[PDB]
Amino acid sequence: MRIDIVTIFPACLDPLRQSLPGKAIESGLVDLNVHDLRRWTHDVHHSVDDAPYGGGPGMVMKAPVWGEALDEICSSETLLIVPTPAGVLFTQATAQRWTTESHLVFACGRYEGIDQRVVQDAARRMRVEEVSIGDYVLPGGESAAVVMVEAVLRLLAGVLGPSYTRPASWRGLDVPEVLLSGDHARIAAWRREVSLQRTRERRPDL
Amino acid sequence: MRIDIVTIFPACLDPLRQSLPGKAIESGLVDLNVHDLRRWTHDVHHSVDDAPYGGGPGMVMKAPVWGEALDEICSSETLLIVPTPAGVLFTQATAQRWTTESHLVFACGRYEGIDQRVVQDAARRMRVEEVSIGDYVLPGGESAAVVMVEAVLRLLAGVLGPSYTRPASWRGLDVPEVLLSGDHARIAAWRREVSLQRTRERRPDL
Numbered sequence A, B: 001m002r003i004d005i006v007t008i009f010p011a012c013l014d015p016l017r018q019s020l021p022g023k024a025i026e027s028g029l030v031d032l033n034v035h036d037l038r039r040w041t042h043d044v045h046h047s048v049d050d051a052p053y054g055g056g057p058g059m060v061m062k063a064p065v066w067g068e069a070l071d072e073i074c075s076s077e078t079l080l081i082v083p084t085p086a087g088v089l090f091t092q093a094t095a096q097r098w099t100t101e102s103h104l105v106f107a108c109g110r111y112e113g114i115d116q117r118v119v120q121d122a123a124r125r126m127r128v129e130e131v132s133i134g135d136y137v138l139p140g141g142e143s144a145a146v147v148m149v150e151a152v153l154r155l156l157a158g159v160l161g162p163s164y165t166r167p168a169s170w171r172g173l174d175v176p177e178v179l180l181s182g183d184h185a186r187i188a189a190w191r192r193e194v195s196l197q198r199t200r201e202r203r204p205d206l
């Protein structure tokens, strides 16, 4: 897999050089490249942003700068991912689906986001997805791209209820007898039962 | 606010030293500390993990090591956050709620997670929350803690539909006339209408 991440904060993708993703890279499973968007700017101030039409707070990332970056980095086989709290929700199904991709490009937004025409123009050449990692607002798309890449790379590396360990009794808290029993059938049943109960309490949406 | 993050991958929290969170730190809004869990180990191999009771794949993070770290770092006023895909969903309401906290501690899990008794034992002294940032599986809790801290710090710093910018026409794509009109009432109505439509298509759960 080839991954390209475009951002005005390259340092924020440094976790992808560590642990599982860093191991996936050095082992040649993935080619990861992080690009500073300012390298596609030409003005004296190397600016990636401008005032929004119709007003609003903050600034908008300019379509001409993004368009020039994506024209260079993307092909017709690329799956362009635009993190946004207005996108479809990223789930484990999405992470599994992205393992079948040859080229992922992440266009990380800052400020109020990226001029909408970047997505519409990209869609003329390649496949584009606006994706949210959850119902919260982040200052930028970088932490979202780390989350998405780690979820995909975990699956790629693997392809290519409560947990307990010793001691049996700690601070007056004992490991449930079922786990000490060595009876796989009883253990599987209990784990399913506790997971169902926890799901009912915390995640009835599931 | 004081934030403590406990992990076997301190480098993975480096994004919190950049951009908005890094600015919140240097301006004295937040005291952020990242702790390597191995510093609370005493065995020859400085190990934080052991085999799970009842079997299963991988390893479990030991309760005695976590208990010793949390005994040192936490107080009765701490809100202990344990990232887990089995927790309640983190949302913008949670991020807003956490801005009222004086001390957040994030216990980042690796492997199959943290022995469940760590949470139960912590709950004897302080408030604990098991939290998921979404319906996907990450290799570790660090990228989840970055997401949560950034969402909270964005709100803390601020307290203490589609976007467009120039040019009006780009690659044959024009900015909607409504945004060029300068009529706030018409702009607000249109933005609400396009956002509602996008919500119906992508997020009927909302």
Ligand SMILES: Nc1ncnc2c1ncn2[C@@H]1O[C@H](CSCC[C@H](N)C(=O)O)[C@@H](O)[C@H]1O
Binding pocket: A082, A083, A084, A085, A086, A107, A108, A109, A110, A111, A112, A113, A114, A131, A132, A133, A134, A135, A136, A137, A138, A139, A140, A141, A142, A144, B161, B163
């Ligand atoms: N929940 C989330 N999921 C994925 N990306 C998010 C996110 N929250 C914020 N972001 C990122 O942070 C950037 C700035 S937040 C701007 C939000 C924008 N007005 C919109 O509605 O799209 C976004 O462009 C996106 O890249």
Ligand SMILES: Nc1ncnc2c1ncn2[C@@H]1O[C@H](CSCC[C@H](N)C(=O)O)[C@@H](O)[C@H]1O
Binding pocket: A161, A163, B082, B083, B084, B085, B086, B107, B108, B109, B110, B111, B112, B113, B114, B131, B132, B133, B134, B135, B136, B137, B138, B139, B140, B141, B142, B144
């Ligand atoms: N969706 C998510 N939200 C928050 N943390 C997650 C997460 N997915 C994985 N993690 C983190 O990654 C670590 C290893 S994943 C292990 C999952 C564990 N068996 C469980 O059901 O809790 C978890 O301990 C947690 O810290």
